[PDB]
Design a protein around this nucleic acid. Structure first.
Lengths: 873, 50, 166, 834
RNA sequence: CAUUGGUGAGCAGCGAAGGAUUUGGUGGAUUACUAGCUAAUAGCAAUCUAUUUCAAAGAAUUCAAACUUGGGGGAAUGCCUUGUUGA
């Protein structure tokens, strides 16, 4: 279930799942906490901008949300988590299997009610502690005491009392002492909602049959009764702006406002939220404000505002009806299709069964917007035919988008269910286009495609004809008729030369788009279901009905790779941007990544819900998928973008049960030396050879033109007097006798000791190794410090060291450079004593090896003579 | 300078004149900018000049 | 923003100058806008002259005198980089100080620079007129307060009233 | 083919912000305007990150482990980029103008100086996968009354010294339990506190102010408290301290002054180690190596970057770039070098790999308009608005000749004969094409016939004809060579802005003011193709524009075009935010590249934010110079009507995104585009794409290795090419024994011959197997020499790469080998005595 | 005869509880989403201000300071510099 290439990132397009949202105040500002499946999101009330998201997904779905100042409490299963800025600060685990249902926090007490009518009280260990952690006591409400707990509320100015509201009646529990202070009279109708009023001792109770009660706890008596026959109260809220208003939300999707002072109805907002998804699940007046925030199960959050009265006198009577202020939303049902709008990962296009198309922004949620379905006026001038009652376009089965001509004309084509024409949209305007493309053969639209240039749109009909329209003018230009069954895929190469089609009849047609000719036809064993064309590589994969993905090269019209392993139908698949991977999803609840070069499955996942779509970002950073459940889009991060991934084939049997290293990582490190006989340069920069030979002249250029000014009184040993790293040759310490010019024993340099050791051992491999590691300045200093006085042992030894190096044929271009520096620094000494046998013998041996390395000159001279001739004449 | 910038450098070039320059023999590496590289190693004076 | 405000001597008019260059003159009681300039420039401070009819604005480098309706009357080329403005109502002198460390007195009636004095203490950080005797108090970065008159090239008094800029 | 990606940015080494040394000290990170460039001084390699801010970078920093880099623009927008993978981890907006950012020496925490608040965050773990909110806040400190100038971490990652504009330096403790240890404020500075540091023992605190005073603080009895025991002063007559840095180990204090000169001091003795001047412009940033031996300085005005080795008094690096000045570019024939001409009058030679300016030329008085290389490559020619065309000899860096018209005309375009014996230049005020003889310097003739200014010129590399285009809506082909001179005019629908000549010399392409690229047949003088480009061009609305970008006709045409050396592609650019790469035979757009994403540049955006618009006008158009504290920033030297050819201070308007010239690399699948920010180079080097050629089911990476083990070298090599995997080609290439090379080379199919030659050239230039590669090249040329001759233009780029390898590295080795042979013989044969 | 001139009188065709044009206001975007205030290692968010004061530290002969002027000629009286007189 864990992928080695992909990891979940977040969900897109979901604002609320229907659980009542929580409102908390930080200073003068307000924020709203909404539940999204197993995670909650925090919005700023002023702008509805996303601020925080829960760091980790809870093991179980969240049931309750309560927020007080910085801290947010989220209840799931039998555990209550405490979050600050979306990061968990402490997890409260109850000691009973009964799941938490309701949650209340007043002062240092946290009250959690389980579904078995048991109330757990947690207290702060210290009065100054930010949140309660310590377990205080347990209070249980028995059936004789009352019915099932409806909600836990705390009224202001009540010392250590919790007002437990049950279906039968209301109860007053003293949390400190754990005793039942007061029991209210039984109510004929089932209670569904409770809300503390801004007045003292009064809590508003909402019944199941459209009755709202202003129950007074101090007197224990009814005060008022509002009646809403044939309705169910889902939320209640009071206006604290100085106006005695009461907003009653209903499961029908209506929000009613009452004026308590005048005993009248101000206004009713009809169908603000869908009845099918629970209507008004939560509707709360912002404290001290005329703004009311409403939510529902339809994945939407809205805000309404009361404007000031237009009458200079009697403003209380002339109440402006509430006005829509701002809202956030998404699909009400799972998206059916998705697509990346642009090369970068800014925007995604989404379509859902709710007949609405959305443009979702990954970089910021506020940028997400719904594309309008308002139709343009017809060019001919005739009246457009349609029902006066406005309805959204049918569900979108397919979509094709290009950005070559964005802002110039239509750049999206969409196919709709049971519809004989395709509609166009404009991404720049975010509105439906002015063209409609018809199949012209009495068949439904099954495939839509666009050319890279953005000028042509291709429509595939269920009767087998491919019609080609022009996006700018919407004029039918060409019609191809090869397939006799439905065309399930159309694609055109980037060059606009070769066009490929596939259909349920199983044939793959290759057309020359410009010449309009049938280049070839290829028959496959099973009907083809879908196509994805990779324009850069000229490869396209086909999802066959035999549970295989067949990769075909359009240039040669042959099958190159065939992929097996899926146990059921392949819902969707996509190419990686580099053209090296295919990620496919199937009905068997798995997502597999396939490596085309080796033609094997390298990664496997098991999704709880079948993934209906899969899409790579053109960058390759992100992978977006949609599932049969959930209104949002799951975004995955591509781990391969930050490290190499092994291409070893996944184990099939272990995967089913759950339901050469250089080649594995697609790399190769060049050998140190292909053969001993072959000359090989050093493993390093090629400027080292040039830096060594011309060191002095390069440094003269480096010196500043004007001498720097310095203080006359300067420490003589400043460079050495350093607090403590410098690894230069100057900063060398001796390692542990008659005076010797080269170096006295116990006072000898590391290099000279290695040189003397090599001379006795008759091998300078250790010396040659350290020479290569020396810096260019260090190399010059050592050679120039070589002993130049009789019997000339060190010079002879150095020549023997270099002569050995040339035999190895490795790093020879440094050894030539070292010998060049030796003559430069000790040429006169060698010249004056050329007749000395030791120098003469050592020099002669060097020439014997050096003479052999003249074949390289012949190779260089040949290639210049030919390469100059071949390129010229 | 001010007039040339004001006219967007659409001025009329100055009359041509001849002047003498002295070139001193130096290694070609010195004339280059300071970096860990050199492009040419020749001398600044040709054999005819010497 | 930010906005520097200067009321008229009789309190009937309000002159406001935003930093980004939004200058407005208005009668705040009756809410009548006498003038409004949208100079695309950095304005530091503004002041009313003898009455609401004329006002001065210290812009990026020069001080400008304006009319009641917002018509520019003069560009004070002599006052450079003025950051503070003050008007001596009984003497009809306009006073400026800024990054130049130069205190300049300008006669609005005759339009002649009465005197320009060198403070020699760098940029001027603060300024306030003594309404009783019309002596200008300037604070400097060295933390001293100097009292000035147009007729003396040297300060009348020097007071050390801070350890840092005033 | 058409898979190009931004690789590095030449022409600029430093724009603004703080330059930072890598922890190992072998890499220098320099912000170049909107991006970050990394220079590897030891290996002589450079690269610029692909991620792009929306405004200029203000602060950057690389953690000690060398894994994470954080870069912050002028608005507080921050990007966390994985240094090793060169990929962006997260984008963070701090919602305020962050002045400095610094990783703790432990690496766990990094601190932000955002206005008057010091923000300490926890570093995201590089190994962990990306999450929604990788950063975790640690603490925010609010003690300063004004903006924080800088901050310094203690060597133990426990204390932070913050210096602000409050004339105060303040110390904090990272751990709350240790707040009592460091809760002090350091006062007594007359001006802004530029920097505060700890000593190596951490018992001494040094603070430096803008006025030029260094205070030495110690914990001493008057019962124990921090006191200023000693005070030192930089007696700069008028220069103000601009940037300060301190190395506790070596006790080195490097101070950069506004006069453009920096001093190195030894604390606490206050001994002046050195004093040097980089110029007259302020020293904006100074940084110290970890060892303390290299000091990096940067000046924003001229874009200078100086790495100084104060120990040896030597310049490791001394570079100066161009901003909004590069008028043209030219590749060397081997492609190793790229030359640029600037409005300053200076011609600079840049090395593609290292990214530094090898040489500079300053003969030209006015802006240099064009630069072009001879076919041979040793000689270079340039033209300038001063009215002279100058020939440059690269081997001795001498202007060996200079050409000038008799009427003193400004020259805007240039063309050089393939033989290098004739030079032609054109003008925008003469209507004639002047011709000079290279050997003599005499004006051979003036070509007449154009009724408008000549916009461009080009010689045919083979036919040696001259093609000229003008605003006269016509193109003329001059047969100047030969006993008879002929001219063939071809009419065009609109003004011709650019012209490119086919390498074959058989066709010429012209970009017109209509946004059209029309290809003509030179011999037949008839049109053979046309490419529409007005729709492809992306042009942005300027802040000052009162008309939409869609209706704007400012630049919907390409002012420069160039063929690919194969002859099948055209790369085009203009005064617009797009570089478009077209395919000639099929007349389609292969790809489009966005030149810049910097909102500082004027032409980047097609749509501007309506919030900026007000009743006065655009909020951007308001000049905020007066708010600046320093006088030099407040001074306005702008001339009223200047558009071009002066310093940026003169224009008074934002720089405009535009491409002055474009060219293809002679030796690689890359192209370079000169623009305002610098010389953008796009290359296909990475080759992560899977672009197979002629696969079958039998071909697989496993199967190729099986062929190698069975010793079927030819089949293994061919199957590797059909996969087209670089690693698999390299594996097979090195596994073929030397005896079998001649057999394999003679038997490679002709289709794969261009591919092997391309691989060898790219591989050989940086590989260590000089002899093995030379054996392969010898086998290939001998086996298929005739085939390469028949198709020169298919193999042109591959052949140039091989020649570069044989000339630039192979010849250098034998040159060092051969001189030892002669130096050897002289020492032994000769008689040395007395 | 032609109007690619204006103004009207009507068809064919398009055509689901109407259609077309213009316009005021507000909301969301137009840069990439880590929450409000303060005296900020924490408080507040109903504020305290009835501990908010003490202690410590903190003052360059830089005791310098128009880098800021449209050109030509002067400048009585001013202002700057230099000397000088008498205290």
């Amino acid at each position: 279930k864990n992928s080695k290439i992909f990891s979940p990132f977040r969900i897109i397009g979901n604002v609320s799942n229907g659980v009542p949202f929580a409102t908390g105040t930080l200073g003068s500002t307000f924020y709203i906490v909404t539940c999204v499946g197993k995670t909650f999101q925090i919005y700023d009330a002023n702008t509805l901008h996303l601020l925080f998201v829960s760091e980790k997904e809870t093991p179980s779905s969240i049931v309750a949300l309560s927020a007080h100042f910085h801290y947010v409490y989220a209840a799931y299963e039998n555990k209550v988590g405490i979050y600050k800025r979306g990061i968990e600060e402490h997890l409260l685990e109850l000691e009973t299997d009964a799941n938490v249902e309701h949650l209340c926090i007043f002062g240092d007490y946290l009250c959690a009610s389980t579904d078995d009518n048991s109330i757990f009280i947690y207290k702060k260990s210290d009065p100054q502690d930010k949140y309660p952690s310590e377990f205080y006591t347990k209070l249980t409400v028995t059936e004789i005491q009352g019915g099932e707990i409806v909600s836990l509320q705390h009224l202001a100015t009540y010392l250590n009392k919790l007002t437990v509201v049950t279906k039968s009646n209301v109860l007053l529990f003293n949390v400190r002492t754990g005793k039942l202070v007061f029991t209210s009279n039984e109510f004929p109708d089932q209670i569904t909602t409770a809300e503390p009023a801004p007045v003292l001792d009064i809590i508003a109770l909402g019944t199941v049959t459209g009755e709202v009660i202003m129950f007074n706890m101090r007197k224990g008596k009814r005060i008022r009764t509002i009646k809403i026959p044939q309705s169910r109260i889902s939320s209640l809220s009071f206006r604290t702006d100085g106006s005695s208003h009461l907003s009653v939300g209903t499961s029908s999707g209506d929000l009613i406002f009452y004026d308590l002072d005048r005993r009248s109805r101000i206004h009713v907002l009809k169908n603000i939220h869908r009845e099918s998804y629970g209507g008004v699940t939560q509707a709360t007046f912002l404290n001290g404000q005329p703004i009311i925030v409403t939510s529902g199960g339809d994945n939407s959050l809205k805000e309404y505002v009361f404007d000031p009265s237009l009458s200079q006198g009697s403003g209380d009577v002339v109440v402006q009806p509430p006005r829509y202020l701002r809202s956030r939303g998404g699909h009400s049902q799972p998206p059916s299709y998705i697509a990346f709008a642009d090369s970068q990962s800014h925007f995604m296009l989404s379509a859902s069964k709710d007949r609405s198309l959305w443009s979702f922004s990954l970089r910021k949620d506020a940028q997400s917007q719904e594309m309008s379905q308002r139709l343009h006026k017809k060019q001919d001038g005739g009246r457009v035919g349609g029902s006066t009652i406005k309805s959204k376009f049918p569900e979108i089965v397919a979509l094709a988008i290009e950005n070559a001509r964005i802002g110039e004309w239509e750049n999206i084509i969409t196919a709709h269910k049971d519809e004989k024409f395709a509609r166009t949209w404009d991404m720049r305007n975010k509105r439906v286009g002015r063209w409609t493309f018809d199949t012209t053969d009495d068949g439904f639209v099954k495939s839509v495609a666009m050319s890279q240039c953005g000028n042509f749109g291709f429509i595939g009909s269920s009767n087998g004809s491919i019609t080609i329209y022009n996006m700018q003018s919407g004029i039918l230009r060409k019609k191809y008729k090869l397939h006799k069954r439905a065309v399930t895929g159309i694609s055109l190469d980037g060059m606009n030369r070769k066009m490929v089609s596939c259909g349920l009849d199983g044939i793959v047609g290759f057309y020359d788009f410009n010449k309009s000719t049938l280049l070839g036809k290829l028959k496959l064993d099973a009907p083809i279901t879908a196509m994805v064309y990779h324009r850069s590589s000229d490869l396209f994969a086909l999802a066959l009905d035999d549970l295989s993905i067949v990769v075909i090269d359009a240039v040669t019209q042959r099958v190159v790779r065939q992929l097996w392993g899926h146990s059921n139908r392949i819902t969707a698949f996509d190419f990686s941007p580099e053209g090296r991977w295919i990620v496919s999803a199937s009905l068997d609840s798995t997502i597999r990544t396939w490596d085309l070069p080796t033609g094997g499955c390298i990664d496997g996942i098991i999704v709880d819900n079948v993934a209906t779509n899969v899409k790579f970002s053109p960058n390759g950073d992100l992978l977006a998928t949609t599932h049969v459940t959930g209104n949002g889009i799951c975004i995955w991060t591509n781990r391969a973008q930050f490290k190499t991934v092994s291409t070893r084939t996944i184990d099939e049997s272990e995967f089913a049960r759950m339901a050469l290293n250089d080649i594995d990582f697609n790399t190769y490190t060049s050998l140190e030396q292909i053969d001993k006989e072959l000359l090989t340069l050093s493993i390093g920069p090629r400027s080292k050879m040039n830096t060594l030979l011309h060191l002095d002249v390069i440094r003269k250029r480096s010196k500043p033109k004007e001498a720097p000014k310095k203080s006359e009184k300067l420490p003589f040993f400043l460079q050495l007097s350093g607090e403590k790293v410098r690894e230069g040759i100057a900063h060398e310490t001796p390692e542990e006798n008659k005076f010797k010019v080269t170096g006295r024993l116990g006072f000898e340099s590391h290099f000279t000791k290695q040189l003397r050791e090599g001379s006795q051992s008759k091998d300078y491999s250790s010396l040659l190794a350290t020479l290569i590691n020396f810096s260019p300045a260090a190399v010059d200093l050592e050679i120039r410090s070589l002993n130049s006085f009789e019997p000339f042992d060190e010079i002879v030894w150095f020549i023997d060291a270099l002569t050995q190096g040339l035999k190895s044929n490795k790093n020879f271009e440094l050894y030539e450079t070292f010998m060049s520096l030796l003559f430069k620094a000790h040429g006169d000494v060698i010249h004056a004593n050329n007749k000395n046998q030791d120098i003469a013998s050592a020099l002669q041996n060097w020439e014997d090896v050096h003479k052999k390395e003249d074949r390289l000159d012949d190779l260089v001279k040949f290639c210049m003579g030919v390469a100059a001739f071949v390129t010229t004449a | 300078y001010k007039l040339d910038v004001l006219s967007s450098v659409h001025f009329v070039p100055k009359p041509a004149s001849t002047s003498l320059e002295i070139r001193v023999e130096t290694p070609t590496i010195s004339m280059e900018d300071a970096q860990p590289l050199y492009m040419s190693n020749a001398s600044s004076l040709a054999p005819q000049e010497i | 923003g930010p906005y520097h405000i200067k009321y008229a001597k009789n309190g009937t008019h309000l002159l406001i100058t935003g930093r980004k260059g939004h200058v407005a003159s208005m009668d705040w009681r009756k809410g009548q806008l006498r003038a409004e300039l949208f100079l695309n420039e950095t304005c530091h401070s503004a002041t009313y002259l003898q009455n609401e009819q004329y006002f001065a604005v210290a812009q990026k480098k020069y001080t400008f005198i304006y009319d009641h309706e917002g018509t520019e009357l003069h560009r004070l080329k002599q006052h450079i980089e003025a950051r503070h403005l003050d008007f001596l109502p009984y003497h009809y002198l306009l006073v400026t100080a800024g990054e130049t460390g130069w205190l300049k007195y300008h006669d609005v009636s005759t339009g002649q620079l009465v005197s320009e004095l060198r403070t020699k203490a760098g940029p001027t950080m603060a300024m306030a007129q003594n309404p009783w005797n019309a002596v200008m108090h300037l604070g400097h970065s060295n933390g001293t307060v100097s009292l000035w008159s147009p007729s003396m090239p040297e300060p009348l008094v020097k007071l050390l009233s801070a350890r840092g800029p005033v | 083919k058409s898979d190009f990606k931004f690789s590095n940015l030449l022409g600029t080494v430093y724009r603004q912000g703080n330059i930072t040394f890598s922890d190992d000290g072998k890499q220098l990170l320099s912000p170049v305007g909107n991006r970050v460039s990394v220079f590897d001084l030891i290996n002589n390699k450079s690269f610029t990150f692909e991620y792009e801010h929306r405004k200029n970078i203000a602060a950057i920093d690389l953690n000690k482990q060398g894994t994470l880099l954080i870069s912050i623009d002028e608005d507080g927008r921050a990007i966390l980029v994985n240094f090793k993978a060169r990929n962006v981890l997260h984008h963070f907006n701090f919602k305020e103008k962050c002045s400095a950012v610094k990783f703790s020496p432990d690496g766990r925490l990094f601190a932000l100086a955002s206005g008057r608040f010091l923000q300490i965050w926890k570093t995201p773990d590089v190994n962990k996968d990306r999450q929604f909110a990788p950063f975790v806040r640690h603490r925010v400190h609010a003690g300063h009354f004004q903006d924080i100038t800088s901050l310094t971490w203690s060597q133990d990652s426990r204390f932070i010294l913050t210096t602000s504009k409050d004339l105060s330096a303040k110390i904090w403790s990272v751990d709350s339990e240790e707040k009592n240890l460091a809760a002090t404020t350091f006062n007594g500075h007359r001006d802004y506190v530029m920097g505060a540091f700890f000593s190596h023992d951490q018992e001494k605190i040094y603070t430096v102010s803008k006025d030029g005073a260094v205070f030495v603080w110690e914990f001493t009895k008057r019962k124990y408290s921090w006191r200023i025991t000693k005070k030192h002063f930089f007696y700069a007559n008028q220069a103000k301290v601009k940037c300060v840095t301190f190395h506790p180990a070596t006790r080195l204090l490097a101070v950069g002054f506004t006069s453009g000169e920096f001093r190195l001091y030894d604390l606490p003795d206050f001994t002046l180690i050195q004093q040097l001047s980089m110029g007259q412009n302020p020293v904006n940033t100074v940084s110290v190596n970890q060892t303390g031996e290299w000091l990096a300085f940067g000046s924003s005005k001229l874009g200078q970057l100086l790495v100084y080795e104060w120990q040896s008094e030597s310049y490791i690096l001394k570079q100066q770039g161009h901003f909004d000045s590069t008028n043209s570019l030219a590749y060397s024939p081997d492609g190793s070098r790229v030359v640029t001409a600037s409005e300053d009058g200076k011609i600079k030679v840049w090395d593609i790999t290292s990214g530094f300016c090898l040489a500079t030329f300053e003969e030209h008085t006015s802006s240099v308009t064009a630069v072009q290389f001879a076919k041979r490559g040793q000689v270079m020619f340039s033209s300038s608005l001063d009215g002279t065309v100058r020939a440059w000899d690269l081997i001795r860096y001498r202007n060996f000749r200079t050409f000038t018209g008799t009427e003193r005309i400004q020259f805007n375009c240039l063309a050089v004969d393939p033989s290098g014996e004739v030079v032609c230049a054109g003008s925008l005020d003469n209507f004639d094409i002047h011709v000079w003889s290279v050997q003599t310097g005499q004006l051979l003739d003036a070509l007449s016939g154009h009724e408008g200014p000549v916009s461009c010129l080009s010689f045919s590399q083979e036919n040696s004809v001259l093609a000229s285009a003008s605003w006269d809506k016509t193109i003329r082909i001059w047969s100047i060579f030969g006993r008879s001179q002929q001219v063939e005019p071809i009419e065009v629908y609109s003004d011709v802005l650019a012209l490119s000549m086919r390498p074959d010399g058989k066709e010429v392409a012209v970009s017109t003011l209509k946004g059209q690229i029309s290809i003509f047949n030179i011999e037949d003088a008839k049109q053979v193709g046309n490419i529409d480009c007005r729709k492809d061009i992306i042009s942005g609305r300027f802040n000052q524009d009162r008309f939409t970008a869609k209706n704007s006709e400012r630049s919907k045409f390409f002012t420069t075009i160039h063929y690919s050396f194969d002859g099948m592609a055209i790369v085009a650019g203009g005064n617009n935010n797009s570089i478009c790469l077209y395919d000639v035979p099929n007349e389609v757009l292969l790809k489009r590249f966005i030149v810049s994403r910097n909102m500082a540049l004027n032409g980047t955006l097609e749509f501007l934010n309506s919030k900026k618009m007000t009743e006065a006008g655009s909020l951007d158009l308001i000049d905020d110079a007066g708010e600046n504290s320093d006088l030099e920033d407040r001074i306005d030297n702008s001339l009223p009507g200047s558009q071009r050819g002066g310093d940026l201070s003169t224009r008074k308007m934002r720089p405009e995104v535009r491409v002055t010239s474009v060219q293809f690399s002679p030796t690689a699948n890359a192209f370079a585009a000169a623009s305002t920010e610098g010389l953008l180079i796009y290359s296909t080097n990475d080759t992560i794409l899977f672009d197979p050629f002629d696969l079958d089911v039998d071909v697989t990476p496993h199967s190729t290795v099986e062929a190698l083990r069975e010793k079927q070298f030819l089949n293994a090599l061919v199957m590797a090419f059909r996969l087209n995997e670089e690693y698999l080609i390299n594996k097979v290439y090195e596994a073929i024994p030397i005896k079998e090379i001649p057999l394999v080379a003679s038997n490679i199919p002709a289709i794969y011959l261009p591919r092997i030659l391309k691989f060898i050239g790219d591989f050989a230039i940086e590989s260590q197997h000089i002899e093995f590669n030379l054996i392969w090249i010898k086998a290939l040329l001998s086996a298929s020499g005739g085939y390469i001759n028949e198709h020169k233009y298919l193999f042109s780029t591959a052949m140039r790469s091989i020649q570069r390898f044989i000339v630039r590295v192979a010849k250098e080795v034998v040159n060092t080998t051969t001189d030892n042979k002669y130096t050897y013989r002289f020492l032994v044969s000769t008689d040395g005595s007395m």
